[PDB]
Design a protein around this ligand. Sequence first.
Ligand SMILES: [Ca+2]
Ligand SMILES: [Ca+2]
Ligand SMILES: [Ca+2]
Ligand SMILES: [Ca+2]
Ligand SMILES: [Ca+2]
Ligand SMILES: [Ca+2]
Lengths: 196, 222, 196, 222
Amino acid sequence: GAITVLHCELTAEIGVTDSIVVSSELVMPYTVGTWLRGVADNWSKYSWLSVRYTYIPSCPSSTAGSIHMGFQYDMADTVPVSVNKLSNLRGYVSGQVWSGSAGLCFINNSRCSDTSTAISTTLDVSELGKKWYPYKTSADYATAVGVDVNIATDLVPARLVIALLDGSSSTAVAAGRIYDTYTIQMIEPTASALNL
Amino acid sequence: QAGISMAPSAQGAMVRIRNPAVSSSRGAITVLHCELTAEIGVTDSIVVSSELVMPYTVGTWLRGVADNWSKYSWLSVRYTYIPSCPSSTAGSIHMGFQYDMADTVPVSVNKLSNLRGYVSGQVWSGSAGLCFINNSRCSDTSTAISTTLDVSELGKKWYPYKTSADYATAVGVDVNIATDLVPARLVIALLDGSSSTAVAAGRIYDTYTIQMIEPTASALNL
Amino acid sequence: GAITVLHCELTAEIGVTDSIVVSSELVMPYTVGTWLRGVADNWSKYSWLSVRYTYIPSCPSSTAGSIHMGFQYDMADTVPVSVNKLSNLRGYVSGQVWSGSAGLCFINNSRCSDTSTAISTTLDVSELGKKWYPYKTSADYATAVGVDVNIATDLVPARLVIALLDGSSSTAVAAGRIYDTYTIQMIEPTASALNL
Amino acid sequence: QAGISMAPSAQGAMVRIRNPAVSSSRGAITVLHCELTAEIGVTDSIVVSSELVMPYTVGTWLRGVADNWSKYSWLSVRYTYIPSCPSSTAGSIHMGFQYDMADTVPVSVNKLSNLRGYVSGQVWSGSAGLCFINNSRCSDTSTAISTTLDVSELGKKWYPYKTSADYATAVGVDVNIATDLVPARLVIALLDGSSSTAVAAGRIYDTYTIQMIEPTASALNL
Ligand SMILES: [Ca+2]
Ligand SMILES: [Ca+2]
Ligand SMILES: [Ca+2]
Ligand SMILES: [Ca+2]
Ligand SMILES: [Ca+2]
Ligand SMILES: [Ca+2]
């Protein structure tokens, strides 16, 4: 009954400016990437076997700026407001917007050489609070969270906080992209139209 | 000697709490400690009280330490009653656990007696449970008024660190939102006393071992 | 130049009521007890080699109530408001107002048998923040502390917080006494009249 | 090869902070950790900045953990600069320590150069200090812009945990009241830049080992 998918897809496009810009992505099928969003909808519940976010650069070596990533686990906790608080989170990694190429091996599965320079981080699936979560659409999530954020705890495993700053322009400059590489188990099918 | 007992005039128990034991394994950090948790007084009518078993409310020290981590798991939680009155004092204490915050709090020792971890005892006894708090070698704990959480049968393993404030708000929307945040609550009942006015009986100490994971600046933790 | 005194004297008389009453004593010569207060004044500075507070009972076995003691080290920190907070402090010990007799051996130096029942606690002289403190009169201390409590840090090593409650009367009932047993080193003499 | 150097277009350093190490010995509890401490930017004119080296201000995590203990002692404190700009960026960074809060903050790299622990470096270099933060095995740290506190020469061993608020008030009465509360302050100067407007240069990470003693409920700690 468990049907397993392994895949790496574009999860977010990154631009860097001269000011801190904190953003976050829920670590659930619907938000992880559009491809998964579409396939996972045909199933009622899932379990993350492995989730790794890897940043791959697209800018010139002359591009100033740094990216910082880390995880949060209680949606009710406040999202880091400074890059300082961010550095306290689990899974913190911080790189420079033009580096990270060695991480490419995580995206195309070829054998990785030295990945100490890859700006990549992974989710601690075993310390998550439950193994089988329900597939949620961001819309429905939003509504729930609107009543009380604590309703999110039963619905989503974690949140990926990203921070970009130290750039040189007041206007966004294309830095790179964050790709997500996951192994997921999907169970109990459903027509997607009913999945909220 | 078998079958004989002598009621003392008063029991004595010298509580001496040792330094908290903290240590980080790989991923998980573990704390072990004891804290005075509640004060107790009896009356002639029954009075039921409850205490949520979550870091924030279990103890004043724990509250501030646990806040630096995102989630936790109880390895062990024990409540022990230590008396502070003479054997001439009337009254009895009763404890037990409830696990669905929406359930009604017991209104009688009869209902109470059916709960998990139920224990009763004269308001003037229980010094035998001292070894649990003091950390000494336990002798005959046969007459101790102490109970413990059935951690393996709890709803889930990892719970999020919550502040009473945020919890209180959640629960205000619907009490069932609590199920996802707190594992259980200790219920305490006292009756069989002689004054219509409360008479100090004793106090309850909490001894726990908790596992904490995934760090976060405290200020962000709600 | 170091002149050493060892002595045990009455430091405080204790009464118990049906409500919590928190009090505190600065762990300095002047407040530790009147005898020491008077002799230590003839010296400019001192160092605590050992300080132990022991409660000895004077009431009937039928006396309800408990005493709780513990130490604080930054005079600026708030004094415990509940017996709960008090139980978090270093050196916490809590006994029942009629017990503690075994502690008598600390007061008259006779060989102690089993002191596990003595309501006694000691000061961690080695973790104090300095070894030689100046002799201060409570008056002068008060003034300093009035400008800013932080001025106390340079003047006093610690504070003994005491809490009495669980009694049976709204009116104080004589429970016992706290005696202090110390070894102190006094240096650099002075006429006492000048010592503030 | 001896005597030859090649300036890169840009240096890269992948920071990855590991789990805090906490453990209780007998009396003392020890923490070891790294936290991002400050953000850096250069201008064409000199700009001096300072950071007190006390738990509250050293790091956002430390701040909340250390608060559960009454006093502390620094076993080690190191500040390491990691760049985030290209080798074409103009600017230099300078660090050093001051120990009497009443002293005037330096107003020039000349005065600054005389301080204890002085270090200078191009605003675009310093990746060699990464091993200090990442905890890797250090290779040639010859070109790292990192400095450390001379803990043995500090004023006293055990300092009280203080909140910036209470500290700020004390210091407001007289700055000399600080001497009794804080061991030293890091001074940071940046100049030699090219814009009148700040240009992001890099950031500073703090790596420390602290000993904490005599527990207290956090709420009481000021
Ligand atoms: Ca659940
Ligand atoms: Ca669904
Ligand atoms: Ca939380
Ligand atoms: Ca001093
Ligand atoms: Ca004097
Ligand atoms: Ca303090």
